[PDB]
Amino acid sequence: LHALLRDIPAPDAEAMARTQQHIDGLLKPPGSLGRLETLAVQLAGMPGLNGTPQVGEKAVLVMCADHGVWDEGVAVSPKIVTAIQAANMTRGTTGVCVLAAQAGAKVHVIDVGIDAEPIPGVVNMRVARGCGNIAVGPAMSRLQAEALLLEVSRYACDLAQRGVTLFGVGELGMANTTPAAAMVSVFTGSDAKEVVGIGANLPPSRIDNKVDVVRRAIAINQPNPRDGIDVLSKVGGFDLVGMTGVMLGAARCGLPVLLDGFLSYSAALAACQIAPAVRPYLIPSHFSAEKGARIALAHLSMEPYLHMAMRLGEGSGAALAMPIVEAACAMFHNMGELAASNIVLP
Amino acid sequence: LHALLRDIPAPDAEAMARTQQHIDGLLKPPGSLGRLETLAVQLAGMPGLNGTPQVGEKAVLVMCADHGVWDEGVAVSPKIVTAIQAANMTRGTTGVCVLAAQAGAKVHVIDVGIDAEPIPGVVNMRVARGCGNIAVGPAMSRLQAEALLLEVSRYACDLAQRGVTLFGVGELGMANTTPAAAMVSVFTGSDAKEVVGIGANLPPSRIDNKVDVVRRAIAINQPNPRDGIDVLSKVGGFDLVGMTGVMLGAARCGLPVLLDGFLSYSAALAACQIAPAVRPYLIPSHFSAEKGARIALAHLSMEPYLHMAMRLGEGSGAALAMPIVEAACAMFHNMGELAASNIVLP
């Protein structure tokens, strides 16, 4: 793990320079394709990409797990939904499944701690049957967190070896917006009220209780904002940990990772905190309809591409952005050049 | 033409109701897929769609033309670029060509007034070799405008007959951001300064001259804001007219049209002014990096899906959004239902 972290590669400045130059000579006014150009340069800097914006196979990794904090009345979805929805992922009827199929990506469902019997078809990396209730203690032990990071990290890089070049990250876990908010509050220093959202349709009247629960989690655990693993293990969850581990794994493999929404933003804060070297490999997707979204993105210094008011999770946002990435590549590779058209601009 | 306008169908409220109901029962928390749900309902209301969000063939219509206002020093791109780039459209090396191929759409290049010899391969609907210099008189005659609207309108609906169900609109014309701004100023009532942009990299120092030119166009022509055809013929251009005509044609055929950027917004203002019935068929794509973008979108009451800081035009933005439309359809049709999972939510 220390190793892993130490071995995350820096972006290739030379490939990025060549990229920029090539982009500038394309059949268009310089800088006219904006963020599409920026994205391309960004991809070119990623070592696992072989010095050019490329997209081979794509995968969406969905980390599933239950949370003890559910018992605090913070989520209106029945607890069983995690297990149910996880099974559905195997059938391709879920939102993420549908969107991923549309993007030509494959969905990997990972059980990191669902409180139910094992689901055949799902990758088993179960830590425990649900995590601890952050309201009265830690979500898990530091050890547990590090082990899972490690394990997920490896699974992630191993995929690279099978042709995957683009990852998408997501989750599934009733009550997960609670630990997400607590993390955000901690890393960001925002008061709970400012970051606590409606999650999966929590009635406005139940909001207040959700805020108190977050403050309690923090008060009791005293997570150290300067230590991402500490924060994750205390007020996080197994699914939060898994997502962070996907990020670490893709970075180590020098590959790009598309974020999803709020939950993913929390994970991303943790990752960057643990290893700043991770930052350049992250790509935002959409702008989540969760209340704490703006705060979390500001701290990541990220501006998503899509404004869809989505708040489903599962990695559905990450899948929806996949075509944008491929577009940046197509632009780079298939557009003709000014010079060939004998076009001269000031 | 009066006919045409009179025959634009109203959206099907019954199909939209059935749509909403179906969406609400999907394997997700109600309203969780946000704008994707809204988009689906919107498509379901379109008569040419057969009561459900569907996407058959897709086409991007690019309206090309030259403007006399170029002689006012408002554009740094050489004038010839229109003709050159138009030819390139036939070769598939352009930005729009590249993005459309990526979206599985076909590009239709339409010459509505390029100041050059005819380009083989391009659909010829040339009004004249470039339009009049709006700075000292009208762009064209009212007659000319109405004829082109009519002609483009028909071409557009005829495609529907060949299986096209989704249109994308775009342009190509050096100096076109000038007439675009003048139109915007007129329909919107904003001062020129607030709507005049850099266009294709116009140096900041040359800005001022661009603003004066817009004020002059308006002063001299006295276009009637309450008459879209009047505005178009006076301070518009043949390409602006063509784009408006695509909109009218798709509406009449009860089909959806994806807008592009700034130039398209100007056209859309005109269309809605001419026929409010057109509004429900319009779908924004991205948020253009042109200065007058926010003003124009506000008046259309539209919020684009993509924030890419693009300013290339050609309909490249419209093509990039095509997959979002298909995503909304996939969502509708392929997601499973709560009831089948025995999931019950409050």
Ligand SMILES: Cc1cc2nc[nH]c2cc1C
């Ligand atoms: C090369 C070129 C391509 C374009 N496409 C639209 N406007 C354009 C302007 C230039 C200069």
Ligand SMILES: Cc1cc2nc[nH]c2cc1C
């Ligand atoms: C059905 C359902 C699906 C979900 N996917 C993510 N969170 C969810 C919550 C519910 C209730």
